[PDB]
Every structure is written in structure tokens, then in C-alpha cells.
């Protein structure tokens, strides 16, 4: 990983978008000048943002590198900075970088920025205990359990993703400034103890709850809880809706298959000032109950609309021959399990027999 002879720029750095960044770091005239070890190891901080660098191939002939700025790319792989041992700070925003794993040995980095780069996977991020700043904003991160292990992080930023499970952050008491904005966080008892923050951000948390079935009077319970536990009160209530705590309550004369409500509550913390903003969406399954009536004992079961009917296993009436599940008691057509849908309205089939 050493050139021994002067060699031009442009044969060590593939990239022509890159080679151009070396040229001008090094105030070259042309991308073809030769270049001694000497110079690129004097290089300690390259600033390429938004250059169209689709790789940084050749950047593992720069020992000393401490600062990279390469926000606004096209990278992927990273394997080039494996060995930069120096690297102090990395901004990566708005690439498709999703190896982490080239980081591991970067025992010396203070600050990581990978926003807008489709991460899900941060697993890798174990290998990084010293970082202090981490900005991971505008990815699909679903999973922060490695948080825990970042005790060094006074900067952190997770907004615009899909996080609910905030528990990993509740021992990161060195935390000073924490965005959390655009997520699925509906329980704040995480941040309770979080004394040192100065800077907080927590607005549109959208949060999901598993579905239930539409009723004609509905009740959901509220399930948005302050850092003491406490229930934020809705702010708006879709539907005409009341809150009659600790429940939200609907009349819905009508199938509808969703409601909603917005809530909106001040937090103090420590010294951090934020606004506790979002809404709860609350998916609704039309149901309707099939009673089946075999002379006059009937059981009830509930079955989606527009859904396939199972069948219950046949009667069976001792003299007689079972001939199927009608429409009505006397007189009607005989259902057909395989081709009729349950309907829109609670009814009835009746089994009929006939003689041997």
C-alpha cells in the first residue's frame, strides 16, 4: 500500500470524479501530475461532498487521513477505508453504503454520518464503542438493541425511521442532543433518565396498532404514555370521536376499516425542551357472525366478510341422511362452501336431512 515512484494521480485514483478531489486537494494542475508518497502522506482531511464519486479506490494509499467528507455520492463498498487507522470523522450521507463491517478496526472515530443510505442492519456497529456522535437519519433501522453498548455517544440522531423500541437508549446517559423525529415511538419511559439533554426532537411518531374488529360502539385503550407512564391526551380525534380516559371511543353506525386519533404533548427533560407529536392509526376487520342452526340448537362463529367459510363438521341425525346447509329452514338453496364468500350481514343456514 506504497507507491515507490513518482506516479500521476489519475493511476492511482480510478475514480475520475475522485481524482479530480486529489488533484485539488494537493492544488495539482492536472489530474495527470505525478505525486510523491511524501505528499499523500500529507494529506490529513479530504472534503468531496456531492462530487458524483462512485468509488474511493486508492484512498488505502493515505495513511494519514483523519477527516473524509464524502456526503452526496454514489458509494458503495468501503473496503478501500478498512486500514485508515487515523480516521478520526466520516460523513457518508445519502449513499447505498450497508457493510459496516469495513468499520470495525476504526478504533479512533469520533464522529459517523449515515443518513439517507437504506440502512436496516447497524448490528455492525458493535465494533465502535468510543464513537460520539452517530447520525443515522432518513434509513429503515428497525432494531436498536446496539445501542446499549455506544456509552461514549453525546450525539445521536434516528429520525425518519421505523424504531418503537426506544429501551436500548435508557443507559446513555452521556446523551446531549437525541432526534428522534419520524418514528413509531409511542412510550417515552425510555428517556426518563436522560438528565444531560440540552436538544430533543420527537414530532409525527406514527404509530400502529395491531387490528381489531369494527363495532357499532368502539373502544380502543390509549396506549401513548409520558416518561412518568402518564397518558398523553389526544389532540384531535378522527371520526367525531371522545376521549373517555384511559379509552378513545367511537360511534360507528357505518363500517369504516380505519380510525385515528393525534396527539400532542409538551416534555421537559433535564434542560432539553421537545414536543411529543404524533398519531395512533387503528386498523378495523368488517366481521359478521354465520349461525348454524341444527333443529333449533344454533352456534355462532364470526367470519370476515368477503372471506371463505369453513364448514363445520356435518350433523348427524340417526334414520336420516344429512343433505346440506340451506339458506332457510323450509325452502331456500343450499350454500356452497367453496364459491359463496360470507356476506356483508350476520345470517343463518339450516341444516336439512332426508329420509333413508
Known amino acids: 500500500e506504497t507507491i515507490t515512484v513518482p506516479t500521476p494521480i489519475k493511476q492511482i485514483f480510478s475514480d475520475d470524479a475522485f481524482a479530480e478531489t486529489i488533484k485539488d486537494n494537493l492544488k495539482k494542475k492536472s489530474v495527470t501530475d505525478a505525486v510523491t508518497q511524501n505528499e499523500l502522506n500529507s494529506i490529513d482531511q479530504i472534503i468531496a461532498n456531492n462530487s458524483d464519486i462512485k468509488s474511493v479506490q486508492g484512498i488505502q494509499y493515505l495513511p494519514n487521513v483523519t477527516k473524509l467528507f464524502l456526503n452526496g455520492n454514489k458509494l458503495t463498498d468501503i ?9 478520526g470523522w466520516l460523513f457518508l450521507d445519502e449513499n447505498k453504503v450497508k457493510d459496516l ?37 432518513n434509513n429503515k433501522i428497525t432494531d436498536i438493541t446496539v445501542l446499549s453498548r455506544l456509552t461514549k455517544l453525546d450525539t445521536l440522531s434516528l429520525e425518519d425511521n421505523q424504531i418503537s423500541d426506544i429501551v436500548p437508549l435508557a443507559g446513555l446517559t452521556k446523551l446531549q442532543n437525541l432526534y428522534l423525529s419520524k418514528n413509531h415511538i409511542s412510550d417515552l419511559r425510555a428517556l426518563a433518565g436522560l438528565k444531560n439533554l440540552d436538544v430533543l426532537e420527537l414530532f409525527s411518531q406514527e404509530c400502529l396498532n395491531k387490528p381489531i374488529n369494527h363495532q357499532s360502539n368502539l373502544v380502543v385503550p390509549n396506549t401513548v404514555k409520558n416518561t412518568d407512564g402518564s397518558l398523553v391526551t389526544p389532540e384531535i380525534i378522527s371520526d367525531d370521536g371522545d376521549y373517555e380516559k384511559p379509552n378513545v371511543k367511537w360511534h360507528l353506525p357505518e363500517f369504516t376499516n380505519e380510525v385515528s386519533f393525534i396527539f400532542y404533548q409538551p416534555v421537559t427533560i433535564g434542560k432539553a425542551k421537545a414536543r411529543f407529536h404524533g398519531r395512533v392509526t387503528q386498523p378495523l376487520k368488517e366481521v359478521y357472525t354465520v349461525s348454524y342452526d341444527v333443529d333449533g340448537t344454533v352456534i355462532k362463529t ?35 362452501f367453496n364459491t359463496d364468500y360470507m356476506s356483508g350481514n350476520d345470517f343463518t343456514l339450516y341444516a336439512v336431512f332426508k329420509a333413508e
Do not use: C, M
Open 101 to 137: 463491517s469495513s468499520l470495525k478496526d476504526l478504533k479512533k472515530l469520533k464522529s459517523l454520518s449515515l443518513e439517507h443510505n437504506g440502512i436496516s442492519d447497524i448490528n455492525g456497529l458493535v465494533h465502535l464503542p468510543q464513537l460520539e456522535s452517530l447520525y443515522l437519519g
Open 302 to 336: 364470526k367470519v370476515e366478510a368477503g372471506t371463505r367459510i369453513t364448514a363445520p363438521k356435518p350433523p348427524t341425525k340417526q334414520g336420516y341422511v344429512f343433505k346440506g346447509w340451506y339458506t332457510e329452514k323450509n325452502g331456500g338453496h343450499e350454500w356452497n
Open 79 to 87: 473496503k478501500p477505508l478498512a486500514n485508515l487507522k487515523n480516521l
